[PDB]
Symmetry: C4
């Protein structure tokens, strides 16, 4: 009903505007796209090859080498066979790439031309080294790492061991593991405090076992996360009828160090009130066979009805028992 | 008796099937094997060397260079000494590798041939830089890092300071340390909830001191991890006789940042009910000598009997004391 | 009034003096500046090019090559066309850069000159590889990573849900996320213990929800951090009048793994007593539009008065209620 | 009196013996020393240069090139100017280094020689790329990172705010910070359990505030860590007289992500019973000046006597107060 803060794929639906502007290289490197970075580097080569080509051409002109490029017994050029700009350009390329076919070749005659080969060589090494580093930076820090973690499409409400629970499923799409993996959840909705303060989107924890460490999971086969709805839950007063009427969002988070990518990851998804299925339970995916366990991921998102599920809130379930005792 | 979820070496015994298919480069790089990646790169060289060889050969043909490859006073080729495809191929290799022996050598005559050396040079740099990056990616992120952490073959049950305890041993195989190292444990077995829900493999925490921080260890010499079996333990009602009858698995985990590999690691092992030795204790490994401590790792896995160990459950041990008090 | 320990931008205002001096390469590499490192490497090239140039020149001299550099039917030089130091220098450059124009060229004659090309080649590879590594080290580990996290200029005191609270705002300047993000706060001031010990700057925790996990945040749009001022707070006895009189500093911290830079970050700021605005509340920044949320960052630092805010301390607010009950 | 488990500099004093032997490349790379790795790579160059030199020499021999190395109108060699092994060797070096002076130069004649240049080029790229990677691996993961964290030489016992405390000092030797920094401590000594089990070195936590988060520190200027000695402390029954008699070791740990090195670090030190100074307090190091704070690190390790410090244990201090109340 209201706008969705976090999309089902984890993407946050929030635009930032009217920010402040401040006056690093590593961040700049990984942002720019491939085709743009490769054009940039090929530009850096052209510019250096033209710059030095022009300088060697000038040196040829002033020395009189364009009139006698091969030299003779009386005359030795600065750089053999520089007879024009194209030849000067070729010698620059040949020097910096270090192809050096050698028909065009520097001589001992001109200390400036010697100096210029010394400088071009060093500039060449620098440009190359930066290209290798920029390529590794972008190679090592991509921005489209395909998600390795999966949330179910729906959450459910149902009874487990005498308690009304909100439940969602998480699974790992690879055979590699998640180290120090742990889960969180939040109820997102606006509210006004008793002092009349408006909070556009207040985020209220959904307890999944933090205080006894049980928020920490060892995720091999898909696990079902449990939030007991009790006094302290923000869903304590919500019945099945309140659900289809209500307008709120539950954000769910899984965090951990993913072996596959060697980086700490935050996977996300969202459940609107209208995506929570009261009186449902998830289809098992894990089955034992021969000498090995197996997970059929088709049943990952699938649920089934439990009609014996109470339709009243957890508060009502509690307050019924205290009355069914007095009289 | 039932299938083993996690093998003694940490390997999880679970196959994934019937997954969903989605439409990164860094993950692709580290997966592919050495011999396959090196063939792939040598293929990328061949392809680029043949591509450009063919292009330079075409340019020679159309220019009439194959009939006069050395040139003369009236005729200058695009690229000296390209007299066939093999020569064209050699010039391509020489240019991109930047060997450039120079017998075959580009001239000033043909702006397209000049352009093609410019392009081949840049393509060469790109291919090389990618090869360096791909080699480092795979070098820095291997998938056969020999385990540096060791679990004992067996767990044991025995008394320590008046309490019946489940115990397993962990040790570090190197002189380098594990930063922020800490342990976990779980009882793995299927169960049906009171509402008739089947959980194929429910994972139930085994308390090793999380709530007072004592799950955190400083692991120099092998340490023995302790799980007090009390009210809250899932082994509270299990006696020595129940053990040899029962069918369950205890997964044990050690996590931390390993100095040796500079990465957060999750070491794993498993104990089936039949691998837990009731009434046993581990052989010490740590002995003081001269001015230095020493660990003999032969006694790591070794145990010895304690016949004074009660054979009844922890519940029975408790319920006996309350009765031996009333009368 | 007293000196500020931590500046508003996070910078700590503390100088270290009279330290102890101890007798790594990776830290040395990232510290040195760009222009200084590039001069250092260009120096390393010059030195190696001159060293070997000199060695090849010596070999030429002793062999008699300077008198017959081209050689003939009876005489073969160690290295063709080394007719002086400049030629020797050029051959050294050409060999190590591997330009190798080849007019100057090593021969089969002198095993020492052959040995020296072998050594120079290897030295060349080593120098190059170090340059690539040093450039990546500095590229990957910069010291001017523009802050991606923002604190408000002021903290405020105001009522929320019946409780007097210290509040500051934190926001994320990028669309990328912060993994395992969490907050801390501290009151910094000197004190003397009852035993007469002076602590120049004692750091006293400001509780922002650590014991129930609520110090952990999922930071998409700017969040307001809450410190309930109660019995256990160090601001329990401080009223609005005490604030404008008092002299203390509150340091605020946000920590987490920042996706943008792939590194664990500690963002910092500070609030002097005189920067805390009693009886104020922050301007909302988050507004719903069309099918998307939006953050206007101009209102980030902006506040508004709440005159219904009590001006007495939290202790006074408490002690009033116990009296307004007895009589 | 007994052997010291952890040295004052953090080094653990434990040898491992009689370990099990198992049948990665990245770990192998960072272990080997510089001079040994550089010899290894220079060996890899020699071997490849000799291998291919020999192959090109064979090709010359069988083709009859050693009798006519320059060729003529009727005869074209496989590789020009290969007149012996030294020339063959030179051509191999020139090809793989890609110096390619070009006097020695491959021709179009022999498909095997062409094939061999193709193979040598690729082998060259591979060897080079591995050298760059191995150099970065060792560059990025050194084993002599100079410690950036300092512990005091002594711990002390003294009163703070009505409580008998064990105290040690920690300081940061750089202006860069430690992210998510936190402390631990342990009492190390052997003991026998009531069931007669010997634990060579039992490690018993020393509480420094874990349960309220106060083990976490923001370390700018040197901080003094506090362990309140109470009921739950293992130093509860230890008086000043017991200290000079006792034989135990307290290990102290500081962990966190160090900005300077971009890695999670564990700093260590130790205090033997004989290094704990009862009735002492640390010299302040932090002083306010002008508009800036300053730390004089000379007073870091320095202490001063407090003769008003009780000489009895914390148990005695407690049990005195309950008696001084009854009568
Ligand atoms: K070359
Ligand atoms: K050449
Ligand atoms: K080259
Ligand atoms: K060349
Ligand atoms: K040449």
């Amino acid at each position: 009903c209201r706008n969705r803060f976090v999309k089902k794929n984890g993407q946050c639906n929030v635009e930032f505007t009217n920010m402040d502007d401040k006056p690093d290289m590593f961040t700049t490197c990984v942002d720019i796209r491939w085709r743009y970075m490769l054009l940039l580097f090929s530009l850096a080569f052209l510019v250096s090859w033209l710059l030095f080509g022009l300088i060697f051409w000038l040196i040829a002109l002033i020395h009189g080498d364009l009139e006698n490029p091969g030299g003779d017994d009386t005359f030795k050029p600065c750089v053999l066979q520089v007879n024009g700009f194209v030849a000067a350009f070729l010698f620059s390329i040949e020097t910096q790439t270090t192809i050096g076919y050698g028909f065009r070749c520097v001589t001992e005659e001109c200390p400036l031309a010697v100096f210029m080969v010394v400088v071009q060589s060093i500039v060449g090494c620098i440009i190359d080294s930066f290209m290798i580093g920029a390529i590794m930076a972008k190679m090592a820090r991509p921005k489209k790492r395909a998600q390795t973690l999966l949330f179910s499409h729906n959450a459910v409400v149902a009874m487990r061991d005498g308690k009304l629970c909100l439940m969602w499923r998480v699974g790992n799409l690879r055979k590699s593991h998640i180290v120090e993996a742990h889960v969180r959840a939040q109820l997102i909705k606006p509210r006004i405090t008793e002092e009349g303060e408006y909070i556009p989107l207040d985020q209220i924890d959904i307890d999944v076992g933090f205080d006894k460490g049980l928020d920490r999971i060892f995720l091999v086969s898909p696990i079902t996360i449990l939030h007991e709805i009790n006094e302290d839950s923000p869903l304590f007063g919500i019945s099945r009828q309140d659900l289809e009427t209500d307008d709120f969002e539950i954000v769910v988070i899984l965090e951990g160090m993913v072996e596959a990518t060697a980086m700490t990851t935050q996977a996300r998804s969202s459940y609107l009130a209208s995506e929570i299925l009261w009186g449902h339970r998830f289809e098992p995916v894990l089955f034992e066979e021969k000498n090995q366990y197996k997970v059929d991921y088709s049943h990952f998102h699938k649920t089934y009805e439990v009609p014996s599920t109470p339709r009243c809130s957890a508060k009502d379930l509690v307050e019924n028992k205290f009355l069914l005792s007095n009289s």
